[PDB]
From Swiss-Prot:
Keyword Acetylation set for record: yes
Gene Ontology annotations for the cellular component aspect, listed alphabetically: apical cortex; cytosol; microvillus; nucleus
Known outcome of mutating residue 84 to V: Large reduction in stability
Effect in UniProt of substituting residue 106 to V: Large reduction in stability
GO molecular function terms noted in the UniProt entry: fatty acid binding; long-chain fatty acid binding; long-chain fatty acid transmembrane transporter activity
Primary site of residence: cytoplasm
Effect of residue 82 to V: Reduced stability
Modification type N-acetylalanine: residues: 1
Tissue specificity: Expressed in the small intestine. Expression in the mucosal cells of the ileum extends from the midvillar region to the villus tips.
Induction of expression: By peptide YY.
Any one Gene Ontology BP term: fatty acid metabolic process
Function: FABPs are thought to play a role in the intracellular transport of long-chain fatty acids and their acyl-CoA esters. FABP2 is probably involved in triglyceride-rich lipoprotein synthesis. Binds saturated long-chain fatty acids with a high affinity, but binds with a lower affinity to unsaturated long-chain fatty acids. FABP2 may also help maintain energy homeostasis by functioning as a lipid sensor.
Protein name: Fatty acid-binding protein, intestinal
Amino acid sequence: AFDGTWKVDRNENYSGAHDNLKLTITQEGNKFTVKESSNFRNIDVVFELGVDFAYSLADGTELTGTWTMEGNKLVGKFKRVDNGKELIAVREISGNELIQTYTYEGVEAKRIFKKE
C-alpha cells in the first residue's frame, strides 16, 4: 500500500511522450511522494506526510493543503484558489488500488485507475 509503481504500460511504447499517467508512491518515514503523472508533465508531489504548505504544481496553481496519509486514506485538501478553488483528493486505497476522489466544490470526481 503506497509502496511501488502503479498503472500504465502500453506495449514497449515508442517516443512522443503522450498522456502517460502512472502512480508510484513509497513512503519512507514521513516522506511519501505520489506519482501524480498527468496532463501537466509528470510532476510529483513531495513532502513529509503531514506537511502543510502552499505549493505550486503547474506554474499556474496554488495547491495549498496537507496530505495526512493515514495508512490507507488520503485526507487533506489542496486547492487552486485562483480558479479551481478546490482540488482535494479525498481518498483511501480502495483495495489493491486507489481511485482518487477529487473533491471539488461539492462534487466527487473520481478518477478510475489502479496499480500494476
